[model samples]
Target: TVLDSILEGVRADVAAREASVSLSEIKAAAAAAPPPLDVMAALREPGIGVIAEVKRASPSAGALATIADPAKLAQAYQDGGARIVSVVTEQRRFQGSLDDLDAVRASVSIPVLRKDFVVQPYQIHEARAHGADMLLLIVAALEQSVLVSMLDRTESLGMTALVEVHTEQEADRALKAGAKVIGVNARDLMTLDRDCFARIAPGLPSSVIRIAESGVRGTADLLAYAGAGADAVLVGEGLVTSGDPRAAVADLVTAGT
Candidate 1:
């Protein structure tokens, strides 16, 4: 897959950088931050509270919403029973900023996750400093050594690591790194391909807390993801684009049998 290849390229780039930086410095930087929130408790709620993602746009989908108000949108999602909020902090492409994360966290009581291409432990500290309750670790975009180092820093900083995988190999690597929470992304990050869940579902460990990401349009889709062993589904576009996001979330919660 082209996405897999792109992610591989990213991994190589990070690895090259990691070779020059000492792991001790990375850990120290993360430790300087305040304690992080309990990410597991937030996600392991009674029912799957949608991990509402806030994005200004995507390379695939250009200009989703002209006025990307993170604070307002996050509050709406929280009111709609969102367990956690995932904010995009990458600015080069997604047009997301740390300011958005700050706004969202200040406006809501829910746990906030910083969703970005985390390549270094420094970036993790940066995310935490920006008010992220959790951090996203894309397994495909990280080598085994880099992944382990990043995961250690994530835990040391008292933050939850939501390890994301697009293939079985990456899932295995994440599991080996002791990742309790895993996100199976249905969209190929590089190629922007859809329906990746069906391809990667068979490879996940049944005991893990599994979450599905991307291409989740409605309740039926949620049901399908649940049927495939997903404990939670991350729906961004469906809920954000809805006239009544709260109502849409209610419908999604009941969509699966």
Candidate 2:
């Protein structure tokens, strides 16, 4: 697949970058930071704790800066019963930065997830230092070896690694790597193509807590995911763009097939 081939190239770049910076150096940097929030405990709540996300913009969506205040937006999400928060930190394309993560974490009590293109172990440790309770590892952007090593390093830093998979093979690889928390993103990262929840639903573990991400629009979509056995859903554009984010959240909670 083209996506897999692209990710293999990324893996090579990450490996070459790591060779220059030692693991001890990364650990030493992480050791000085405070402990991260408890991500697993937060997600363990009854009903899918809505993982509210803050995305400034994307290559596909253009500019979505209607409500750009990370702190205020995150506060609204938490007030609406969000169990965890995901903040985009990719600066160049996403128009996101570490400052966004810091802003949201300081304003909310829930565990904050750093959603970015995390390819290296140093980036994982850097996420920890930035007060991220969880880090997103997209399988389409990383190799199996890099994914495993990054997961191991994330656990060592007392942070949960939310391994994201878009295909059955990626899901299998993540499971084999002992990933407890998995995110099934319907949108293909490379092509930005979206598939129905039903298509990817079967790839997830029946008993595992799976978070269905991307392409979530309305109550119907949320209901479809629930019917497909999703434990939680990460919503961004819908709630963020809504006039009443809190009410939107309440509606999604009560929505069913």
Candidate 3:
């Protein structure tokens, strides 16, 4: 399975990173940096916020964008009203690097999400140290206890977790892990119906924001998610491949309203 393969490599890479960077060094760097951005407040802002991602490619897409300069693209997303910037820092299948995350954070003023398959505590430190305002924690990829522990570590460092879920049960686990921001990734749904949020979100606590991830291509898509009560949308492939990314993002930003 693709998910299993992705996790296997990620675990290997994470092990190598910890061996090289050491947890103490990452913690020191995290402490030296400014606090993570106020993502909770950013999501609470009026209208449906967009967190634009800087991704070169995904395994499914092979290669999507050149992305020679991630910072440049990230600034454009900021100018186009993206409430948060998402940078793919996974170097294996995604063709992204931590350098991109660092560069984009330096270039953009808003919150930045370090989108990766995080499975350990050290990755959380690495995220904060590298200027990530938020980090991704996919529910399907982690043990529940590990997920809960990592979520606590992220918040302890002043960062937030965008817990990704595809099912109602996964969403329940995310809430149990203390996730304030939850992302419903359409691609993760084996059923492919992907209308679970429309049915499940209403039953969730109001403080736990619902974010619709993937399958957002235009104003119509944004409208669909907004109608489903998503507080924000995390768009990647669409904006990255758009010829006029700035305009594309601007259109989505206003589409939620």
Q: Among these predicted structures, which one has the highest TM-score?
A: 3
Best by lDDT: 3
lDDT by residue (tens digit), candidate 3, 158-220: 998999988889889999889898988877523233575676677679889899888887899
Predictions in order: lDDT: 0.77, 0.79, 0.89
The runs of at least 3 residues in candidate 2 whose Cα sits more than 4 Å from the true structure, single-residue gaps closed, are 1-29, 194-196
Task: Give the residue spans of candidate 1 off by over 4 A.
Answer: 1-34, 254-257
**Candidate 2 pairs with clashing backbones:** none
Model 2's alpha-carbon lDDT is 0.79
Could you tell me the lDDT of residue 49 within candidate 1? 54
Q: Residue 40 of model 3: what lDDT?
A: 93
Q: Against the hidden true structure, what lDDT does model 3 obtain?
A: 0.89
TM-scores, each model vs. reference:
0.84, 0.86, 0.96
How far does residue 119 in candidate 3 sit from its true spot (Å)?
0.3
lDDT per residue for candidate 2 within 1-257, as digits (tens), equals 54555446545654654687566765666788779887887777777567888887876787777456889988888888777889988754567877899899899988999998887777887788778999998888878998898899899899998989888778889898879888888877777774645666677666566888876787788777877877788998887777777777767766662
Cα-based lDDT at residue 218, candidate 3: 89
